[PDB]
Design a protein around this ligand. Structure first.
Ligand SMILES: CCCCCCCCCCCCCCCCCC(=O)OC[C@H](CO[C@@H]1O[C@H](CO[C@H]2O[C@H](CO)[C@H](O)[C@H](O)[C@H]2O)[C@H](O)[C@H](O)[C@H]1O)OC(=O)CCCCCCCCCCCCCCCCC
Ligand SMILES: CCCCCCCCCCCCCCCCCC(=O)OC[C@H](CO[C@@H]1O[C@H](CO[C@H]2O[C@H](CO)[C@H](O)[C@H](O)[C@H]2O)[C@H](O)[C@H](O)[C@H]1O)OC(=O)CCCCCCCCCCCCCCCCC
Ligand code: CLA
Ligand code: CLA
Ligand code: CLA
Ligand code: CLA
Ligand code: CLA
Ligand SMILES: CCCCCCCCCCCCCCCCCC(=O)OC[C@H](CO[C@@H]1O[C@H](CO)[C@H](O)[C@H](O)[C@H]1O)OC(=O)CCCCCCCCCCCCCCCCC
Ligand SMILES: CC1=C(/C=C/C(C)=C/C=C/C(C)=C/C=C/C=C(C)/C=C/C=C(C)/C=C/C2=C(C)CCCC2(C)C)C(C)(C)CCC1
Ligand SMILES: CC1=C(/C=C/C(C)=C/C=C/C(C)=C/C=C/C=C(C)/C=C/C=C(C)/C=C/C2=C(C)CCCC2(C)C)C(C)(C)CCC1
Ligand SMILES: CC1=C(/C=C/C(C)=C/C=C/C(C)=C/C=C/C=C(C)/C=C/C=C(C)/C=C/C2=C(C)CCCC2(C)C)C(C)(C)CCC1
Ligand SMILES: [Cl-]
Ligand SMILES: [Cl-]
Lengths: 37, 318, 32, 44, 30, 61, 240, 449, 34, 148
């Protein structure tokens, strides 16, 4: 488990690992706003 | 002119009835070697102890067997993944008894199919064609590699490799599901979709073009010229581009076969398909059986039977 | 369930960050 | 023992060379081929 | 002699493939 | 103290999220970086400073 | 390779060499056997390396006498009995008793005789009770069934575990096929072995010599008649 | 940004519009590095948070922590995890580092110049400029050499890597005599990939591992200096395609092979991948089962030495085709397996039934029993079990995950090599787009048949 | 059977050499046109 | 038709017959399954095992080195001596402050010696192994004096 001081921050660390997969999705979103020039 | 240069030309010569190439230089001999041994083995090869239990399974048309039953017995389990060159065998008879031909054929065959892929690109570059025909041929080659190399390696024996025969292929498929539940593997599902879909697309594309060119004109130029597009059931514009349609005609089947091949490779590392046995439970805990459980019942039967005398311990970790 | 609740709160804020940047940039005629 | 075998299987011999001849032939064949390639088309 | 019959069939099929590649009708058409 | 490190870590998280959205905006904003780069530097300096504080707090916690 | 020489080599150095399928050689010691003190000694590290496997076979002529014929081993090595412990004694006279107790006393071996016929046999001296002189210690040994009762045939019919009937042909499930179905006889047979001490190393308490044994071949659980297999080779043991 | 009308590449090939944009290309690569470092840090902290000291790491589906544990961090005698804070430090460091790389990439992708050659000549580079390309390779070659030497330093200094084969028990050991003999270091390279030889996967001693990294470290640094002060020779220029896609295809092909090798390493090697943290290997699990029953039956009163099986090839023990005494059963295929728990009972000739009869230590049993249960066999839904098993155990060997994932990665990257390489060669020729419709080569070729 | 090994080893080397040296023979110039 | 023969093997459980089953009980903590907790709990049992390892290191091993039985000597190390490191650690843990620290220091100096001797066996150097073994014996005796 995370140190006691960093324990209250467990929920955040549970969401961090999935952040990278969102970046590729954001790319397609940007192209959508760009209208896929 | 330097003779080596002269030779290099003849090798890259396009005037050859069958384009030879630097890849062919290695492909031709390897495949010729595998074909010769395969023909002699499928006809006169003596029995082989595939299970390494001193129980030799008969093979070749001479030793009984038949076109359907006949097959090239995989190498003995005793050898495992060890290299078994003819010269390593004390006598050619031992090489046949241990199941050496199978290893030799597979080795001289896989190299050939890989070189066949390279030869495809070689001619495409020589003719001035795009270089992705081989990528499509990579899908079948990948599948063959998994059944004749990746899986044998993952399991830890060439005996696990698919036998070079009709009945042997069926045996390999059955035991595989009994131990990996390939049917419940999402990748195998993609592969089945690829072949089932590929057949559907092939039948439709063939029918559309045939009905059109029924008469050099574009595959559908005729129907397009009439303008009576069947958008009634073909209400779409994604494949209006012939290049777009043909691309899909290649992507769908190839990508599917790639997944099924990778699926087989993953299962070769003991990554079996979804296991939902006893997943549905009632309030008090009684197990409510499902179709999955019924499939498991069959898998158990194949498991308890496969290698009747080749298991001295309960768990089949191997 | 407080941990799970604040976990979902974090997921919402983080996931909304990327679209937030785009929407804002698009709104102010940014270089997107 | 009852029979004679190379006894090379399982041994990690470089390029499966269990006899000096094997090693010499491999280098010799490559050297001749290199000479032909270099003479036919100089490398550098 | 069933094996002899089987070998004949296999050999015959291969022979057809042979002529189908080297003794095939010249592809005058594209 | 645990509270000091936790509070400081929370502050770093807030500053981080601000930069996560603010930096890309300023960078892609027409003439929004040449005039706001200094403000970005101020925010970036605070973020790195908070990182150091959290680390020091860890040793004293 | 003497026992100590083998001990010096690591498993990896021995792995792939094949020396593991070879009994240690008593290079030291004396050819004389008189020095061998009279008494009972633990037959530890008893190894039997078969030099040759001959199978008795009628001469070419239909009535040709059945003589042992040369054969070619099909099973890569894996035929040297080793790590066998037993009881060996010697009297003031030539009286010598060699009794095998446990260890790798058995070793399945499939050899091909001239004519492409593979004859499988379980090379073994289980329960050997030799009681001849220091040389020619004649004795008899057990020859357990090559296959166990559990062993199932291709048809699935077997001894303790098996169909016992030709399930394939329902109408002919039970008939003259009885010899092959519901038989699966696993009764053990007997074989004769003779051992002779070529040399004795009194200082190291190690003995080595030649062995000769004729044992029945596999009977396919009674499906086929057994065939005499004459196995001759060298034996090494440490009397400690 | 950019549009297809000005690049000829559609949105699905947008990153291909950055080939000649050195500045933007820098941002893209730098940013991607941020993503990699991010996951390394994020997942590590996630594992640390989801870690429990009552279970082995392999049972907890942890993949990153085993790596740090092998480096000899927060581990103790027997592989027991003493503390996890070192692992937390690694996650925090990587996570914060990823921020720096992320900012650099974003900057070099937005504010940064699309090209650098015009402003920063050193960074400025043009595909085909072999001299510059070789120099760039040199810089990175030196970097990798330094990284390998950092590992070598950790082995002989700043503590030591965990040695599963450590004398008197497995624990971290400071390598003091790393193998530098070229014959031993390069022997693995010329070893057959078949069974027994196991090519480089056979490495079982940390001394060779550290010594091998010493060799690769030096060669890479020297090679970098060479490529930094040398330009491709005529033979090379006449036998290679000089283009960005061609250079990428070369890397794709190489990294693809490396992926396959890594898969085999994780599935077969137990030294570089301690079974204590990564769990038992396929062969290890099989041998463990044979040992478990052999011990149990022997205690019940069975002579495993003279125990003929149904086939008659020995129920518990038998002889390898080579001659070495090996465990009986289908595990005969894994007779070449070597584990720190089985070596003590082995000897010059295969196993030593003497040790098997007496001297079998309790740990040798407990370890085998645990490995047998935690075999690599598993399902996609993580239902631990050989197969045809009920949904009761939730475990999939980390080795299985790494082996399957990296194999698939290697396969795709090899396909990428074929795609990029072929396109690069076609591009150079000029027929990448298609046939001229006026200079069709076939029309000028012999009518063949 | 070493003679068989020596022969195979030579045969293999020869074909492999042809492939390597063959591609070294300015293969990229085999393009139909440019 | 014969009744299945029955044998009184209740003594097997006494001779660690449930070791495998206990190690395979996932419900038990990993330390319990490995037996680490049990040993740490049984001080006398741990101390005994330590003395057994001492005998193997002292009144043994030298034999193989004399006859160049490297395989056996290297296997002599580990095996029963395999737990020695864990054993010495828990005994030192019994100590406190400086006592524990000093004991751990002796444990480390000994562990280093056993590795030096093992490397000598790896290089099959009898002379180095002989002298190295003597050094290892002294180191162990020092650690034993502190841990015991
Ligand atoms: C749509 C597709 C399915 C999406 C599912 C999303 C959640 C999920 O995924 O579900 C799984 C988990 C979330 O669920 C948890 O999944 C866990 C999976 O087992 C893991 O944890 C277990 C805990 O007992 C064991 O330790 C086990 O060994 C270990 O593998 C357990 O089942 C937990 O009980 C369960 O809650 O998320 C994850 O894993 C996320 C995984 C991210 C990618 C992982 C890639 C792995 C390699 C891929 C390439 C190789 C082969 C691919 C083959 C196909
Ligand atoms: C290469 C291809 C042939 C591989 C042949 C093979 O037997 O494969 C396995 C070998 C590893 O061999 C094993 O390597 C093992 C290494 O473990 C050994 O050493 C370990 C050290 O920790 C342990 O001690 C362990 O107990 C001990 O057994 C052993 O040596 C085994 O005897 C040995 O069989 O792979 C290797 O050597 C590495 C080969 C490179 C990776 C190849 C991966 C597959 C690549 C492509 C697949 C797809 C192809 C598509 C078409 C193209
Ligand atoms: C590793 C993933 C990755 C990366 C690093 C890049 C990087 C890049 N792409 Mg790209 N792209 C990707 C994936 C990726 N792409 C995918 C999957 C697709 C297919 C949909 C595309 C399709 C695509 C096209 C069609 C184009 C690019 C272009 C570009 C370049 C400039 C982008 C632009 O012009 O406007 C920038 C975009 C934005 C400003 C919108 C938001 C992007 C920001 C920078 C992301 C930051 C997120 C993060 C939370 C910020 C952290 C801040 C920090 C303080 C924490 C740039 C170097 C353009 C180009 O240069 O062509 C020559 C272009 O035309 N891409
Ligand atoms: C570091 C490796 C690498 C790099 C730098 C590139 C770079 C490039 N590739 Mg490429 N490729 C690679 C690996 C790589 N590739 C591999 C391994 C394969 C085999 C699958 C391919 C197959 C491939 C094809 C078929 C094509 C390219 C193309 C391109 C160019 C267009 C970029 C683009 O699509 O714009 C923007 C980025 C995108 C549109 C990507 C969209 C995001 C993808 C589709 C989602 C995939 C998510 C994935 C499932 C997550 C799991 C990944 C992994 C764990 C399995 C570009 C320069 C195109 C080209 O024309 O070449 C010049 C093209 O046709 N590549
Ligand atoms: C592959 C790694 C890499 C490479 C090759 C470069 C290369 C370059 N960077 Mg850079 N940078 C990087 C990583 C990298 N950076 C990272 C990770 C960060 C985040 C801290 C930065 C942040 C950064 C800044 C803030 C600046 C550069 C700048 C520059 C350019 C000139 C540097 C300079 O000091 O002169 C000046 C140069 C082409 C300078 C530039 O003008 O960009 C073109 C500059 O302002 N970089
Ligand atoms: C002496 C000059 C020099 C030096 C020292 C470096 C050093 C480095 N470069 Mg680099 N580069 C240079 C010149 C140089 N570069 C030039 C002139 C260019 C053309 C503009 C590039 C373009 C470039 C790119 C596109 C990338 C790098 C990257 C990297 C880093 C490698 C990180 C990695 O991918 O794996 C990790 C390294 C190790 C594990 C080795 C351990 C030590 C590394 C620190 C990569 C990076 O991610 O930047 C951070 C990367 O993507 N460089
Ligand atoms: C990622 C690592 C890497 C890469 C991509 C390259 C790539 C290259 N090297 Mg190289 N090299 C490396 C590592 C690497 N090397 C190391 C570690 C050393 C030290 C042993 C060398 C020593 C070296 C020398 C001495 C030479 C090259 C040469 C070459 C070029 C000729 C093609 C070739 O494959 O070499 C050779 C051909 C085949 C392998 C086929 C080529 C671009 C040659 C060159 O062009 O000079 C710069 C050259 O003579 N390299
Ligand atoms: C990813 C993709 C897959 C690959 C990943 C990377 C794998 C690397 C494996 C490297 C293995 C290095 C082997 C060195 C050579 C060797 O050992 O040979 C010898 C080995 C073993 O050979 C045996 O060795 C024994 C002792 O070790 C005995 O001597 C035996 O008599 C001998 O036959 O056989 C081979 O592996 C060679 C097979 C290939 C021969 C040349 C074929 C060339 C085909 C195409 C060429 C195209 C161009
Ligand atoms: C680490 C950390 C940080 C940071 C974080 C982050 C990084 C955030 C952001 C994140 C992100 C980055 C987000 C984003 C995501 C994405 C999204 C949200 C999208 C989605 C989309 C969809 C779902 C759809 C799509 C589509 C379209 C629209 C187009 C076409 C294609 C498709 C169909 C696909 C913080 C501050 C917390 C602090 C602490 C630490
Ligand atoms: C260019 C572009 C792109 C993108 C790119 C990218 C990918 C970017 C990224 C970048 C990045 C890469 C970012 C990141 C960030 C992160 C961060 C910033 C972090 C932070 C951290 C913190 C704040 C802290 C935390 C903590 C610790 C460590 C301790 C414990 C607790 C906690 C966890 C809380 C795209 C695709 C759209 C396309 C278009 C263009
Ligand atoms: C660390 C360590 C170590 C070491 C390792 C090593 C030493 C590695 C290296 C490896 C290597 C050594 C790599 C390299 C690679 C390279 C290659 C493999 C080559 C390739 C080539 C190419 C790719 C080319 C081709 C071609 C031809 C020739 C013809 C024309 C065309 C072209 C040019 C394309 C050891 C073992 C102790 C283990 C432990 C750890
Ligand atoms: Cl079967
Ligand atoms: Cl088994």
């Amino acid at each position: 488990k995370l140190p006691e001081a960093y324990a209250p921050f467990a929920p955040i660390v549970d969401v961090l690992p999935v952040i990278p997969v969102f970046f590729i999705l954001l790319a397609f979103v940007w192209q959508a706003a760009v209208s896929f020039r | 002119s330097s003779l080596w240069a002269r030779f290099c030309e003849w090798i890259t010569s396009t005037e050859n009835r069958l384009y030879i190439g630097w890849f062919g230089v290695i492909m031709i001999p390897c495949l010729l070697t595998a074909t010769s041994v395969f023909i002699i083995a499928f006809i006169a090869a003596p029995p082989v102890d595939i299970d390494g239990i001193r129980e030799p399974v008969s093979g070749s048309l001479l030793y009984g067997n038949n076109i359907i039953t006949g097959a090239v017995i995989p190498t003995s389990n005793a050898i495992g993944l060890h290299f078994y060159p003819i010269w390593e065998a004390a006598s050619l008879d031992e090489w046949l008894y241990n199941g050496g031909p199978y290893q030799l054929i597979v080795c001289h065959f896989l190299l050939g199919v890989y070189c066949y892929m390279g030869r495809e690109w070689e001619l495409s570059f020589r003719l001035g064609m795009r270089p992705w025909i081989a990528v499509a041929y990579s899908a079948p080659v990948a599948a063959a590699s998994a059944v004749f190399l990746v899986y044998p390696i993952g399991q830890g024996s060439f005996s696990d490799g698919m036998p070079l025969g009709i009945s042997g292929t069926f045996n390999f498929m059955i035991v595989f599901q009994a131990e990996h539940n390939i049917l419940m593997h999402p990748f195998h599902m993609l592969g089945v979709a690829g072949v089932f879909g590929g057949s559907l697309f092939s039948a439709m594309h063939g029918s559309l073009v045939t009905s059109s060119l029924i008469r050099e004109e574009e595959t559908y130029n005729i129907v397009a010229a009439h303008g009576y597009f069947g958008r009634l059931i073909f209400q779409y514009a994604s494949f209006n581009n012939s290049r777009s349609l043909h691309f899909f005609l290649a992507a769908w089947p190839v990508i599917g076969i790639w997944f099924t091949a990778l699926g087989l490779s993953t299962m070769a590392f003991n990554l079996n398909g979804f296991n939902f046995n006893q997943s549905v439970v009632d309030s008090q805990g009684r197990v409510l059986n499902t179709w999955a459980d019924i499939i498991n019942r069959a898998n158990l039967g194949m498991e308890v039977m496969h290698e009747r005398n080749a298991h001295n311990f309960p768990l089949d970790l191997a | 369930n407080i941990e799970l609740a604040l976990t979902l709160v974090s997921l919402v804020l983080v996931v909304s960050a990327g679209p937030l940047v785009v929407v804002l940039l698009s709104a102010r005629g940014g270089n997107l | 023992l009852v029979d004679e075998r190379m006894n090379g299987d399982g041994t990690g011999r470089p390029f499966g060379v269990n006899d000096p001849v094997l090693g010499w032939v491999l280098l010799g064949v490559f050297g001749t081929m290199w000479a032909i390639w270099f003479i036919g088309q100089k490398d550098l | 002699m069933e094996a002899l019959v089987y070998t004949f069939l296999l050999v015959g099929t291969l022979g057809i493939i042979f002529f189908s590649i080297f003794f095939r009708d010249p592809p005058r058409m594209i | 103290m645990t509270s000091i490190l936790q509070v400081a870590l929370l502050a770093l998280i807030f500053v981080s999220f601000a930069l996560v959205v603010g930096v890309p905006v300023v960078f892609a904003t027409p003439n929004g970086w040449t005039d706001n780069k200094g403000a970005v530097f101020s925010g970036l300096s605070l973020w790195l400073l908070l990182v150091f504080v959290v680390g020091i707090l860890n040793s004293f916690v | 390779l003497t026992f100590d020489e083998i001990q010096g080599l690591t498993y990896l150095q021995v792995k792939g060499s094949g020396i593991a399928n070879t009994c240690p050689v008593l290079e030291s010691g004396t050819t004389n056997l008189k020095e061998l003190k009279a008494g009972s000694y633990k037959l530890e590290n008893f190894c039997i390396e078969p030099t040759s496997f001959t199978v008795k076979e009628e001469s070419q002529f239909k009535g040709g006498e059945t003589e042992f014929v040369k054969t070619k081993l099909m099973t890569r090595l894996t035929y040297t009995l080793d790590a066998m412990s037993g009881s060996f004694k010697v009297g003031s006279d030539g009286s010598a008793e060699l009794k095998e107790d446990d260890g790798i006393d058995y070793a399945a071996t499939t050899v091909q005789l001239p004519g492409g016929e593979r004859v499988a046999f379980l090379f073994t001296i289980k329960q050997f009770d030799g009681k001849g002189t220091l040389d020619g210690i004649k004795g008899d040994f057990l020859v357990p069934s090559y296959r166990g009762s559990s062993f199932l045939d291709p048809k699935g019919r077997g001894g303790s575990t098996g169909y016992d009937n030709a399930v394939a042909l329902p109408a002919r499930a039970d008939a003259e096929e009885l010899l092959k179905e519901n038989v699966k006889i696993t009764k053990a047979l007997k074989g004769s072995a003779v051992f002779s001490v070529a040399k004795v190393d009194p200082v190291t308490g190690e003995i080595a010599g030649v062995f000769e044994s004729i044992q029945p071949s596999d009977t396919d659980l009674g499906a086929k008649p057994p065939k005499d297999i004459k196995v001759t080779g060298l034996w090494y043991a440490q009397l400690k | 940004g950019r549009d297809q009308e000005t690049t000829g590449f559609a949105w699905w090939s947008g990153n291909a519009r950055l080939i000649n944009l050195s500045g933007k290309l820098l941002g893209a690569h730098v940013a991607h590095a941020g993503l990699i470092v991010f996951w390394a840090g994020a997942m590590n902290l996630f594992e640390v948070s989801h870690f429990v000291p009552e279970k082995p790491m392999y049972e907890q589906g942890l993949i990153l922590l085993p790596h740090i544990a092998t480096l000899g961090y927060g581990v103790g005698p027997g592989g027991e995890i003493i503390d996890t804070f070192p692992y937390f430090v690694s996650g925090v460091l990587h996570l914060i580092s990823s921020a720096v790389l992320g900012f650099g990439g974003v900057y070099h992708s937005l504010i940064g110049p699309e090209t650098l050659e015009e402003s920063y000549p050193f960074f400025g580079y043009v595909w085909k400029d072999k001299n510059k390309m070789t120099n760039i390779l040199g810089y990175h070659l030196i970097m990798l050499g330094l990284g390998a030497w950092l590992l070598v330093w950790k082995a002989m200094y700043f503590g030591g890597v965990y040695d599963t084969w450590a004398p008197g028990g497995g624990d971290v050991r400071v390598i003091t005599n790393p193998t530098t003999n070229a014959a031993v270091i390069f022997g693995y390279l010329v070893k057959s990939p078949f069974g027994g030889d196991g090519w480089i996967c056979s490495v079982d001693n940390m001394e060779d591992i550290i010594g091998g990294h010493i060799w690769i470290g030096t060669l890479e640094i020297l090679g970098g200096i060479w490529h930094i002060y040398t330009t491709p020779w005529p033979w090379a220029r006449r036998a290679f395609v000089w283009s960005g896609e061609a250079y990428l295809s070369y890397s794709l092909g190489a990294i693809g092979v490396m992926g396959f090798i890594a898969c085999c390493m994780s599935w077969f090697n137990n030294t570089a991948y301690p079974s204590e943290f990564y769990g038992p290997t396929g062969p290890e699990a099989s041998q463990s089962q044979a040992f478990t029953f052999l011990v149990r039956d022997q205690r019940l009163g069975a002579n495993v030495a003279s125990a003929q099986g149904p086939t008659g090839l020995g129920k518990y023990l038998m002889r390898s085709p080579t001659g070495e005494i090996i465990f009986g059963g289908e595990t005969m295929r894994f007779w070449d397996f070597r584990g720190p728990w089985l070596e003590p009972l082995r000897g010059p000739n295969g196993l030593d039934l003497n040790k098997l009869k007496n001297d079998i230590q309790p740990w040798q049993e407990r370890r085998a029993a645990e490995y047998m249960t935690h075999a690599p066999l598993g399902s996609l839904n993580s239902v631990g079990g050989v197969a045809t098993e009920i949904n009761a155990v939730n475990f999939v060997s980390p080795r299985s995950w790494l082996a399957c994932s990296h194999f698939c990665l290697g396969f795709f990257f090899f396909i990428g090599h074929l795609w990029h390489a072929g396109r690069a060669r076609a591009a150079a020729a000029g027929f990448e787009k298609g046939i001229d419709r006026f200079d069709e080569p076939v029309l000028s070729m012999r009518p063949l048949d | 059977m070493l003679t068989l090994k020596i022969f195979v080893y030579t045969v293999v080397t020869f074909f492999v050499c042809l492939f390597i040296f063959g591609f070294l023979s300015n293969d990229p110039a085999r393009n139909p046109g440019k | 038709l014969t009744p299945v023969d029955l044998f009184d093997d209740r003594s097997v459980r006494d001779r660690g017959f449930d070791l495998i089953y206990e190690a395979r009980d996932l419900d038990l903590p990993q330390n319990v399954r490995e037996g680490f907790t049990q040993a740490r709990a049984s001080l006398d049992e741990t101390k005994k095992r330590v003395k057994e390892s001492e005998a193997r290191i002292d009144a043994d091993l030298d034999v193989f080195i004399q006859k160049s039985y490297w395989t056996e000597a290297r296997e002599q190390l580990r095996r029963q001596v395999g737990t020695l490191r864990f054993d010495l650690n828990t005994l030192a843990s019994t100590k406190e402050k400086e006592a524990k620290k000093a004991a751990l220091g002796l444990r480390k100096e000994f562990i280093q010696a056993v590795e030096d001797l093992d490397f000598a066996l790896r290089e099959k150097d009898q002379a180095s192994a002989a002298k190295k073994l003597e050094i290892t014996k002294a180191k162990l005796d020092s650690v034993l004096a502190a841990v015991l």
